[model samples]
Target: TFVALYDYVSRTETDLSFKKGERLQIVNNTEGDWWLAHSLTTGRTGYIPSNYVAPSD
Candidate 1:
């Protein structure tokens, strides 16, 4: 059911690792821009590789 849009939610302080759903202000880590960083559904912060996720398309 994800022809164009995919749903997601963070289980912990996981990183976004992508930008399609970055409307939540997900950004690369200041210390490590090689990885995208974001907060979990609960506001915990961490890092993930930018290649770890793909766009909804």
Candidate 2:
């Protein structure tokens, strides 16, 4: 069953366009759980499973 709160790390679900080791925050107008962030530098947002994101951390 899906709980209401959780936390995770950037395991394998990182933005490759940055050469790695870049912290990311949620972009504006992001739909959530099925889309990546749209970064002007990366030319696109990276993909991460919804689970990887902290529920509120």
Candidate 3:
């Protein structure tokens, strides 16, 4: 699962942005600097910055 600590704005087709406190499911994390995740809130899947999210508190 995921809960971003920051907001991200998608810069590419493989990227997605979300607001803080949003929860997502991490799909992958070994692709360059991006981590593939799924947004349960939006039912969207895309790459997010690895440093932009952390485990939910």
Q: List TM-scores for all candidates, in order.
A: 0.32, 0.29, 0.88
lDDT for 12 (candidate 1): 48
RMSD of each: 7.3, 8.8, 1.1
Candidate 3 local lDDT, 1-57, one digit each (tens): 879889889999878778888899998887788889999888889999888888985
Model 2, stretches more than 4 Å misplaced?
1-22, 28-32, 38-44, 55-57
Among the numbered candidates, top lDDT falls to 3
* Residue 16 of model 1, lDDT score: 36
What tens digits encode model 1's per-residue C-alpha lDDT throughout 1-57? 001123344444553322334422245546654444443333434555434444434
What lDDT does candidate 3 reach at residue 32?
A: 84
Q: Which prediction has more favorable lDDT, 2 or 3?
A: 3
Clashing residue pairs found in predicted model 1:
none
Model 1 misplaced regions, further than 4 Å: 1-25, 29-33
Q: Sorted on TM-score, highest at the top, how do the candidates line up?
A: 3, 1, 2
Displacement of residue 53 (Cα, Å) in model 3 is 0.5
Backbone atom clashes (below 3 Å) for every candidate:
0, 1, 0
Per-residue CA lDDT of model 2 for 1-57, tens digit only, reads 111122223346454233232344445326666335443434546554444333223
Residue 54 in model 2: lDDT: 35
Model 1 weakest 10-residue run by lDDT = 1-10
